[PDB]
């Protein structure tokens, strides 16, 4: 895997060269499908290596959900230095994998035939995507995971082909997805930034480090936050707010070039607060009108090989819409709220208008890129500030 854009051009993509995506060296000045929709689709599942079988995971079965939780907890994405691993919770996985329109065959597992052990996964969920001047029904691909003992055995290309086949069967021919690695061909490159909330714990676990000309006492004072948010009328989102949150979001996202197009049911699903999964706060002004909202989702990570600190509680910026409160004030209150809720760090990407507040609110740039990709869609690349899509 290549993490850098120039080091990826020294690479050969035996699998991705067979796929309908632009070549990494290609420069795109067209808008449309790489290849036409297929009007006949392979009916049989692709072949897995001997001893492994497909299994669609019913995540409404608590035991199966727990098997997925364990597969990801032990084998999903780690940082560069193998010190931290994502720790998606079971109830978070239910939120991310059963939005409106979810399909059981799109929760695509791989099991050992003998032991029944879950050793592979990939998922699709449906999403209407606005890309420049086109609105397309697509899927979002997420949670591609291969057990560590199954790695480097061409199992991931099979998972990609098999979910592609199952999506094609439902009449969808484009997808969107993100990754930390460079593949053919990013439609946009974003960067994670981090805002320390408990700088002490973060330095002790070597998530962060003390700056050269700074001390620990200075570091704690630098990152100190108000006890309570300052925006008048800020409160948790309630059911009565679902229409206005939908309206605010739809209007706000028109300015970007890669965005979701959410129904009101999708807005309920993605924003209605659920403890330890998703937080949404609206601004209800002195007239009783909701004029802004902030949101962030809960995604802890496992701290590997540490005798005392086992987990890092992280908040991830989701969608933040401002029409009367300045964005800078909204995000300051998000940090205060995340601090109040026990989070250790607040992460945000440099997409949408986030660059207007990252430096001012004392975020530090991260070392990991997040590349955005479209499958079977040719369009010009865009800068981070035009990406208006956040995936879990």
């Amino acid at each position: 895997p290549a993490k850098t854009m120039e080091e990826a051009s020294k690479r050969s993509y035996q699998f991705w060269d067979t796929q309908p995506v632009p070549k990494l060296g290609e420069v795109v000045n067209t808008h449309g499908p790489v290849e036409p929709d297929k009007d006949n689709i392979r009916q049989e599942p692709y072949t897995l290596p001997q001893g492994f079988t497909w299994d669609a995971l019913d995540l409404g079965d608590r035991g199966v959900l727990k098997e997925l939780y364990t597969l990801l907890n032990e084998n999903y994405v780690e940082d560069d230095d193998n010190m931290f691993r994502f720790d998606y919770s079971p109830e978070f996985l239910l939120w991310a994998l059963r939005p409106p329109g979810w399909l059981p065959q799109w929760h695509c597992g791989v099991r050992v035939v003998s032991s029944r052990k879950l050793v592979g996964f990939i998922s699709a969920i449906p999403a209407n995507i606005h890309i420049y001047d086109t609105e397309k029904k697509m899927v979002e691909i997420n949670f591609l995971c291969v057990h560590k003992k199954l790695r480097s055995k061409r199992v991931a290309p099979v998972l990609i082909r098999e979910i592609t086949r199952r999506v094609h069967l439902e009449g969808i021919f484009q997808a969107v997805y993100t990754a930390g690695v460079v593949l053919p061909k990013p439609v946009g490159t974003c960067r994670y930034w981090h805002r320390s909330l408990n700088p002490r714990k973060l330095i002790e676990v070597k998530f962060s480090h003390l700056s050269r000309n700074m001390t620990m006492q200075r570091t704690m004072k630098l990152y100190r936050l108000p006890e309570t948010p300052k925006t008048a009328g800020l409160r948790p989102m309630e059911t009565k707010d679902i229409p206005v949150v939908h309206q605010l979001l739809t209007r706000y996202l028109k300015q970007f070039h890669l965005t979701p197009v959410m129904s009101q049911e999708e807005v309920e699903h993605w924003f209605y607060p659920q403890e330890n999964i998703i937080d949404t706060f609206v601004v209800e002004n002195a007239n009783g009108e909701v004029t802004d909202f902030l949101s962030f989702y809960t995604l802890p990570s496992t701290i590997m090989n540490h005798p005392t600190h086992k987990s890092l509680k992280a908040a991830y910026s989701f969608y933040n819409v401002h029409t009367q409160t300045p964005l800078l004030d909204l995000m300051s209150d998000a940090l205060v709220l995340a601090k109040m809720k026990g989070f250790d760090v607040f992460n945000a990407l440099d997409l949408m208008e986030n660059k207007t507040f990252l430096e001012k609110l004392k975020f530090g740039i991260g070392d990991g890129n997040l590349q955005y990709y479209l499958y079977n869609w040719k369009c010009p690349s865009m800068g981070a500030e035009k990406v208006g899509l956040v995936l879990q």
Partner: peptide, 7 residues
């Protein structure tokens, strides 16, 4: 999806 540390 991509695990980032402060650079």
């Amino acid at each position: 999806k991509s695990f980032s540390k402060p650079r």
